[PDB]
Symmetry: D2
Subunit: 175 residues, 4 copies
């Protein structure tokens, strides 16, 4: 009851173009291993994207550190702020460091802005964002590196779930 939307080779092809585009944008920063690009992986749905994107960034000679954050939605009392409860926070300080928030798909603009405000509180040198799936409004202003464009659809596979199932599929499918 699922149809393929993007195959692994397509996702890889798109992620690899994204990696070169990232690599050329951060050239002017002279990144090093003591001052790398930090990949901020938002669990769970981003973990396979992060793993593949990291290695594509290695292909470009970009130095990478990998941080994970995990947050839980509130049942009530969130209207305009996208507040989520932080369960896992970064192991390393990110003061004056270059952060790339790695998302699979922007479910909630306002919740994305909240996470951005949370990281901005940590005084980073730069905050930018890379979203695997981009369905094209005026909250594209929040997304810097949209990897692949898709129509409005409930998707699974490639780390993304329906009810915790199907994260393990190589291709991205729709329901």
């Amino acid at each position: 009851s699922a149809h393929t939307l993007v195959t692994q080779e397509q996702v890889w092809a798109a992620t690899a173009k994204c990696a070169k585009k990232i690599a050329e944008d951060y050239r002017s920063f002279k990144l090093t291993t003591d001052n790398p690009l930090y990949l901020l992986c938002v669990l769970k749905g981003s973990f396979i994207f992060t793993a593949d994107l990291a290695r594509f960034l290695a292909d470009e000679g970009v130095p990478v550190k990998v941080e994970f954050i995990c947050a839980s939605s509130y049942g009530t009392g969130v209207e305009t702020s996208g507040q989520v409860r932080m369960l896992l926070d970064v192991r390393d300080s990110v003061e004056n460091r270059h952060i790339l928030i790695v998302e699979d798909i922007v479910d909630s603009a306002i919740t994305l802005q909240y996470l951005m405000r949370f990281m901005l509180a940590k005084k980073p040198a730069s905050l930018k964002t890379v979203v695997l799936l981009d369905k094209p409004r005026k909250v594209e202003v929040l997304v810097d590196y949209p990897v692949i464009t898709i129509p409005h659809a409930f998707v699974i596979g490639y780390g993304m779930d329906y009810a915790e199932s199907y994260r393990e599929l190589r291709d991205i499918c729709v329901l």
Copy 2:
């Protein structure tokens, strides 16, 4: 090898004056149980203060909800931002709610400001602070309700530790 600095009855006497002062300041807000004053208890050192202050706030007819946060210091890479790693975050949304950060003593201005930035990201109606022990500089601008003034000293008791020991003492002592 410890001398008493403040006895329980003194701490209580001061906290009770603070509770009335708080109660009269938030009168203009018409607090209710659906819109209370949230006490943000910064673990561990504040837990006994919070427990006593809450009940003093009950004496004033202030409605109270109690949140806990726990954060760990970074070993390296923090210079100007007071970044700490959040281990426990609030169970309730605080959007448009009245928050009172409950500290025992301001060890680090910049780390206090970081926690303040973290809460401010959650869009509260008001953010204010109450610090049990206040040693009198220009970061008094960060402290709204200093309960008791003391000289520069390493203190223990009343929830406050030296090496996790002595939180359980009724009186505040110095070393």
Copy 3:
């Protein structure tokens, strides 16, 4: 107190009970030669235990018992729990408790299985001893009672507020232990 139908135990009654319990605890651990460097660890289960922890620690101070305090916080799962009572740890202890004496501090035992899980959790840290102290012992058969070691106030079954315990996150700040009026 306007939201209280009955008052169940007053602040003064709770303290007196807790002072008695602290002396029972201090007698039971005299043989164990507790030091500052090998104290009794108070495991405050958040949130409900926190006022009770703050007072019980000070009654233990009266008894001359060296203490340290650790906090844990666990969230319940939406489904898939039947026999095990597992909960998602959101905050684990800051100090290792290997070969230490731990007292799990609880306000009420509302699920014996989850209490059992918390203990299995704690027993995996290989403590020297593990006991529990429950402020409100509510009606229970042998299954629960073998879990609780130090019941402070034996109490009939009711909806309690106050003394750290909540209704819809409200009323923890009350000085007395109250019964919530039906019209909440």
Copy 4:
């Protein structure tokens, strides 16, 4: 790779090993009638296991095995750990794992006691089965080896970087498993 003295296992070598391991896993759980609603849970120990988890899950997908993924993250304690290997849980699983089949996913077994603790931790959630998969099996006597169930690549003792594994939080992004040059 400039920071690499030797190359230990290449990306292509690791995949081939992991595909073989995934088929061994899929044969071993055929009897258990794994469903979407009763799958094999992958317990990714952060951070080092994450690239390995992402690839191993997709090799399990090739084998037709239904998966779910949970992450845990634990910090080491400064002191007071000797026999128990306990670690402070910073992230516990999001789903209950009561009566489920769990595979702890590890990059290397660097402390048998801490691996034992993680298992005691997991065994308290009363899973239906608990097994471990380790990408790099390094030299070890019977003590460790009885803990590891599915070793992917048997390997000599060295300082590895790449494929998720780090030096000073650097080099996780490398496609190959490398040996760090002495002059780091």
